[PDB]
Amino acid sequence: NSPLAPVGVFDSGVGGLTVARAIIDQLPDEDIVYVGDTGNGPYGPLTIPEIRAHALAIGDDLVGRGVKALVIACNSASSACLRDARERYQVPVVEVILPAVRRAVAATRNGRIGVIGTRATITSHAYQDAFAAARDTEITAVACPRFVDFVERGVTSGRQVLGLAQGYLEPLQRAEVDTLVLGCTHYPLLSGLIQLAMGENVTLVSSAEETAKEVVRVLTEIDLLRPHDAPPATRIFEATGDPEAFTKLAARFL
């Protein structure tokens, strides 16, 4: 398309703002259209065909509006629909699983890699299968279903949530992982808590951070960066559910 076209970003809800904020941090001149599917999410407890239906509806709307690139900020939606998206859209698609996978394989020292995410992300085996091409690595994947509710309620330090994480992460500790993928939009807000649980030696990998660096790479190489001397960037935020409820909760992630 045109370098002046927006970047589309979408998510199951409000937590994908961690990805959007990281993209905007790296790319202050890009126009952005963010859509959070608060009308139909959370995607965490849904089935894969349910998630794909919801995500592709938003994907089709954003591509229909002329975005030059589509970013799937939700790890659950990335599991359910990257296959479809590759073939369905002609714009480049960035998502949140593969940039982290590549970072984790480069960052590990003993080859033992963990990943945490929603039930739907972990049950899909997107991470387990994506890591199968990595020589000399052992993957341990664990769903952490209550993490999302604790992040949104703002309860991310202290004894209650620390015990919750110790119970979730025990298999990763037992497996002696030295690298841990935060495979969910909400989990960067728990990186201090998770690091305390896992100890100093474990490298945490943020989906938001790696994906934003990948958007920089992708727009640079296909020569579609919106120019610095273009007008001030426009950033549009839309919700499929209650816009006022979205605005209230977004303060937690912005």
Add this chain to the structure above:
Amino acid sequence: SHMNSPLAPVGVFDSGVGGLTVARAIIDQLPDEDIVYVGDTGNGPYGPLTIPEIRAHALAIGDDLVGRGVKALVIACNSASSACLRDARERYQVPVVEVILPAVRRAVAATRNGRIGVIGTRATITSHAYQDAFAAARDTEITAVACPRFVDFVERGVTSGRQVLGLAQGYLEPLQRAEVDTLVLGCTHYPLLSGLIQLAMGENVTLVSSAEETAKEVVRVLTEIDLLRPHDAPPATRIFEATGDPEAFTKLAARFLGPV
């Protein structure tokens, strides 16, 4: 006072507006902590100053924050930590967290080939604070490079494209030749270049964010001393102050806080 009340605020200070990346990362982790942030826009940038000039500026702000009763002090500025951390250990009795040591410990743990790079202001690099802090790390080789233009590039919003890539390829060339696989972003502004730097350094280089590691340290410190502000306390208060022009601080802060 080692131990103030858990209801006391956390003090964060910086040479100006760039330390908001550290304060935002702290607030991300710790939504129920009261924050007082002071950014020394009236005397910055610290990057081109001497160590004694930086120290005197920074301690004047630490003195204010401590006198307000903060329960912990975060030196968010890598130039300032280089110049005054030593003084702050004796001058202040509340816990002091800063941005050099957490990233050093991370870098030591994250490297695979033992080759570690660090970039920062001229003051930070020529102080040898990173070179000396790494001396205890056996089987490591440190390469340190000052990147003086990175700060104004970040602040004026120019962080991708050919111009800033060519500028970054020139700075980072010694690190590529040294074959580092780990790079400490030893400056407050550099997280806003991490995509540009990752692109110049290749995919095998692990970038280490001062903001991120220091925020995780604050979570750990407050937890282990049991000084976390409780979730059922009133909503957290977050004060941001500038020693220089208030309207310029607000305009520049937009770059580091992100969309409203």
